[PDB]
Design a protein around this ligand. Structure first.
Ligand SMILES: [Zn+2]
Ligand SMILES: [Zn+2]
Lengths: 202, 201
């Protein structure tokens, strides 16, 4: 009854337990344990840097986001920018990664203008990061955040960057992000700006 | 419809509104296979193939051991074999691989195990092809770790598999034989010991 606006998305998800397949349109998926992600994160951190690990989860996310936007692209042409864009935040729910809640969204392809402010609720990433690390000193939601930047950047034809303003990892009640075109912040590893920003805004 | 998997599908809930996916206690993620391809490409070039391969078995092993924990006391009114099938079934629910049983005999009590399965539509195989193309040797490492991790735990001893044909080598499907450790004609902390073992291919 109540995934009225999700439904068109669910309609592309095919479970096929009997053949070891799960599909979103043309692409496969895997139902994965979060605590297994928690291990992959700590093991990576142990092998590489905080920095190289960080960088991986973000680039990862950027990818997932771009692919979902490819997918959900030819999918709501009846609708407008805002309602189509939403597919993104909805997919993050669908994949059980995070609950997106919109404080503010203003966008327009042709104006090359974007500003998003959302609350992330129930982030897995923050939850797993606490087990393996405890109270962090920076935000933890790298993957979610890469995906955020990715999805968005696909949708507008320009690079959209997010800052995680508050994070459950850091003790904040919910997590929160803000997203604006790269330049409105005063070779496509956009991965490096994200880290440089959370740095050069102490 | 397909009633062999129900006691599993049941323990799964999709709360898309609050962005949680649920397996009993455990919380789950529906993910692109891209994160695993990427990880494969990055690791391949930062560390050896040996190192990348090992890491992947280790990861596969942790998930095998988890489902093993979770499905543990779930099928007490069936026998060892149908109980055990939980792992192979889970691997398919998780959309990683279809397991088609060629042969299976197990006794926890007698310390006995022999599994010979076919793997079909292996996701790992797929990933390796579109990152590295034809392998020299079987490539379904994550999958193999799981096999090893799951079996091992149920059995309460060290069960090691070998991929014997792999889509990654042009075979039509992949194949695997799992025996106990001592039944191989070649010779905690121990979770790392075991990954070290299933790495001698
Ligand atoms: Zn967070
Ligand atoms: Zn294979």
């Amino acid at each position: 009854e109540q995934n009225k606006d999700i439904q068109d998305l669910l309609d592309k998800i095919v479970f096929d337990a009997q053949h070891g397949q799960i599909w979103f349109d043309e692409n496969r998926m895997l139902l994965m344990h979060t605590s297994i992600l928690g291990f992959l994160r700590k093991d990576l951190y142990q092998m590489l840097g905080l920095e190289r690990t960080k960088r991986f989860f973000i680039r990862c996310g950027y990818q997932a986001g771009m692919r979902d936007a490819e997918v959900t692209s030819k999918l709501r042409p009846n609708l407008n920018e805002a309602e189509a864009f939403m597919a993104g935040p909805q997919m993050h729910g669908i994949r059980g990664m995070v609950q997106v809640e919109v404080n503010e969204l203003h966008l327009s392809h042709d104006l090359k203008q974007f500003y998003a402010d959302f609350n992330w609720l129930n982030s897995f990433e923050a939850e797993v990061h606490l087990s393996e690390f405890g109270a962090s000193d920076q935000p933890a939601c790298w993957m979610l955040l890469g995906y955020a930047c990715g999805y968005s950047s696909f949708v507008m034809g320009q690079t959209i960057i997010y800052q995680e303003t508050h994070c459950v990892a850091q003790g904040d009640e919910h997590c929160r992000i803000i997203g604006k075109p790269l330049s409105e912040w005063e070779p496509d590893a956009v991965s490096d700006e994200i880290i440089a920003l959370q740095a050069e805004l102490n």
